[PDB]
Amino acid sequence: RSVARMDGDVIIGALFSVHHQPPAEKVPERKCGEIREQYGIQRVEAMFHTLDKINADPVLLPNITLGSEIRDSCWHSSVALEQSIEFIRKPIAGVIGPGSSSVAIQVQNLLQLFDIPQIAYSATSIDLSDKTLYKYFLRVVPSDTLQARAMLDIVKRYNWTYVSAVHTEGNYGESGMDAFKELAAQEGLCIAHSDKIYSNAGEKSFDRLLRKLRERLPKARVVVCFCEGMTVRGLLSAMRRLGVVGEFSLIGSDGWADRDEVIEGYEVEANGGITIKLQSPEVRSFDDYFLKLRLDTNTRNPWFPEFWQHRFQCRLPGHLLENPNFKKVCTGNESLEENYVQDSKMGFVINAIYAMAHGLQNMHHALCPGHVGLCDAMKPIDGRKLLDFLIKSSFVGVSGEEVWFDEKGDAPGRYDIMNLQYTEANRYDYVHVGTWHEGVLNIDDYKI
Amino acid sequence: RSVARMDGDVIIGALFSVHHQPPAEKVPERKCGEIREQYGIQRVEAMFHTLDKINADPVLLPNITLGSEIRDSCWHSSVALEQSIEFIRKPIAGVIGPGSSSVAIQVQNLLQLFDIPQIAYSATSIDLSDKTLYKYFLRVVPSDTLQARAMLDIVKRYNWTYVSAVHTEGNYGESGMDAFKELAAQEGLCIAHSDKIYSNAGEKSFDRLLRKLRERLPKARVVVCFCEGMTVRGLLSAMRRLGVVGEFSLIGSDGWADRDEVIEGYEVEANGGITIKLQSPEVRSFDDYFLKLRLDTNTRNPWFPEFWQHRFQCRLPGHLLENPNFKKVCTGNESLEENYVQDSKMGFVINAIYAMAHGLQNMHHALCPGHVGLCDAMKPIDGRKLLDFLIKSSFVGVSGEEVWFDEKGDAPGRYDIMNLQYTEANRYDYVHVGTWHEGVLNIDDYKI
């Protein structure tokens, strides 16, 4: 399988989802789904961008260059464990990833056997907060303990006390929802029908979903979906299938947030929905970089040739990788500004990329103090040591954000409430309609 | 980490639980608790013994010899996940183990990456039968869907329409039940109340079960149980705790079994119940072998020194494997005859072993025709092939039973239907009252 490499004195491996998950029947041979941009190409071009800049910064790791081994995760343990095994066949320092929470349980379950620290940026699951099993796991994002705390608080808000709960099957959906289920049970929140599904269900299973969800009404009008991105798409997909809409008010975890890949197209039904989104400041910096990219100037990232063929439904033939599921050629001069939208979670990954570096720094100051570069004490890099020296590191984010980790592993997290609707210009836009910091819920009644 | 090795032509690696798992805090360091003879030593000495009787048999594996690489599993996914890595680095043909499904997936998740065929004898969850996920997993034991499929049949046999389903929270119950559930919607069995109880739950919630179950009467005197025995005792506890006896009828899976350490004290409230006892018959030969064991001469199995002292609470002075606890040194001539009880799963263990040999054997008939030992096509062993050679393999057991595997990877099932009644003596016995033999039930319409 193809890897995006970059040499360096230090090597930090990472796992980004560059293709969608593998189709059902192909999971044994592990042929991954199609290419992505937001969870995929941007996160690879972002892992690079921030690493060229880190290294060129005279302050952090003055005479120590950083390298990485970026591999594809496909949002699935097998492809993940596959690539994770490739790290142990220079030896990696730390791993950034993988995509899903559940996946990480798999990713580190193995890493901790070689004492390799791991920093997540999208795993909001709670199970990870436990370090006895996943000792070497840490993240720059906050736990669902908070996110589940507020989703329930967004409910009390409008006097709703009858609401179903659908959750994406896995370790992400179990942990978050079980909480949303304990919390409610304290507040004496009665819940209607409850059910879960696999993000890659048969279009036939989805319909069953809406059936059971519609077979119980009109009491249960509002829904809690602590659910994966497409998992919601699929529910909408069924919505359209049954040609009915405006029936429920959904409430999606950051699985939705303000993504378009979810409602791109199916806008007709995903309205009035309420979403959660960790308040990651837009990375104004990244965009200046992304756009300027070319088909032939970017060689380090092996996926571009394929990624490009898709962003324009054209094709560059002749070179090995080609997508013949199309007709027109490429102008050769396509511009990325067309409908471009920076990954929502984009911020975190960059920072987490920093966190991994700071550790190296705080350690260097500790084990090879007064030395120009790396030293005998630092070759090789002792894992357990790079750990401690991590939890204990803290700095200003890539864009004005305090970033640090508590003893357990988790970090500081806060999110805003998003709403999707029809603005003035003919367009379904995601609208900011309230925020949530430490139990305190702030929405904008007038903006809704 | 200590291993029990044996040299031969083909090495079949295995994972037995020889030590209890390490407590949570001690886990990141892998300090597995105490040595286990029940699910531990009796098997290691059984993995050794069996392989002996096979190299003793001139009918099967005539000139090819089986050797073993037996590693400790600690009934945990990490000490097992660890030892499994010691496998991928003569190489191992097939893995026997481990004992728990929670563990099976973790391991099998890895093994399937390098094409190692794995045969389990203890894992029951339906999760594994989904052979996309684990193409290389197979077992000589039935799946729960099968064990439940019979409980669904002890019910269809009496035209009981409404029923309740309680299952111990976690793997054994949640896995088996989720099947008792499908089968019932498919055959028209309305479920009245389904609820989960962690074995170690309080009387508070252990009681709430009763209040909820009874609430759903008398249109449902049948409470189903895919529970763990303790979840069952606890239910009885509340029974006598509230004053009720003989209200409803329970059907307990092999979790309860015809065990006697489940009804002590609470006998009166449990009479009338129908349980599922997985027929594991006994292996005289093992016992003839185990007993005649001596500390001085069993060197292949490195744990015996550790094992011996524990079993007899004595010490080998000045020896590595030493004990500070008790001080009565060992005579060297003590019989295990004291309270000895043959592992209740020993059979399965063994039938797995054999299976792993038949495959090699039957494969070498095909890939190595007319050749005496191993012929080049088998040097080295191609696992992806050994798989098709195993799956389509079949023999008689060590009890007379017949073994084989369906396409998926699952085997048959044989079940004894036990009923608890008041004997002709001042005691209550688990009376044998019928059997479920590979798709077929046999009830006694006047023996209940």
Curated annotation (Swiss-Prot), chains A, B:
Protein name stated in the entry: Metabotropic glutamate receptor 1
UniProt binding sites for L-glutamate: 39, 101, 122-124, 172, 254, 345
Subunit-level organization: Homodimer; disulfide-linked. The PPXXF motif binds HOMER1, HOMER2 and HOMER3. Interacts with TAMALIN. Interacts with RYR1, RYR2, ITPR1, SHANK1 and SHANK3. Interacts with SIAH1.
Ranges of the Extracellular topological domain: 1-448
Positions of disulphide bridges: 32-74, 225-227, 314-330, 368-375
Shown residues within the full chain: 36 to 512 of 1199
One Gene Ontology term of the molecular function aspect: PLC activating G protein-coupled glutamate receptor activity
Family statement drawn from the similarity comment of this UniProt entry: Belongs to the G-protein coupled receptor 3 family.
Glycosylation sites: 63, 159, 333
Endoplasmic reticulum found in the keyword field: no
Compartment annotation: Cell membrane; Postsynaptic cell membrane; Cell projection, Dendrite
Free-text tissue specificity from the UniProt record: Predominantly expressed in cerebellar Purkinje cells, CA2-CA3 pyramidal cells of the hippocampus, and mitral and tufted cells of the olfactory bulb.
Keyword annotations: Cell membrane, Cell projection, Disulfide bond, G-protein coupled receptor, Glycoprotein, Membrane, Phosphoprotein, Postsynaptic cell membrane, Receptor, Signal, Synapse, Transducer, Transmembrane, Transmembrane helix
Purpose of the protein: G-protein coupled receptor for glutamate. Ligand binding causes a conformation change that triggers signaling via guanine nucleotide-binding proteins (G proteins) and modulates the activity of down-stream effectors. Signaling activates a phosphatidylinositol-calcium second messenger system. May participate in the central action of glutamate in the CNS, such as long-term potentiation in the hippocampus and long-term depression in the cerebellum. May function in the light response in the retina.
Chief location category: membrane
Effect of residue 32 to S: Impairs protein folding and abolishes location at the cell surface
Other comments on record: Activated by quisqualate > glutamate > ibotenate > trans-1- aminocyclopentyl-1,3-dicarboxylate; inhibited by 2-amino-3-phosphonopropionate.
GO cellular component, one term: postsynaptic density membrane
Gene Ontology biological-process annotations: calcium-mediated signaling; cellular response to electrical stimulus; chemical synaptic transmission; G protein-coupled glutamate receptor signaling pathway; G protein-coupled receptor signaling pathway; L-glutamate import across plasma membrane; locomotory behavior; membrane depolarization
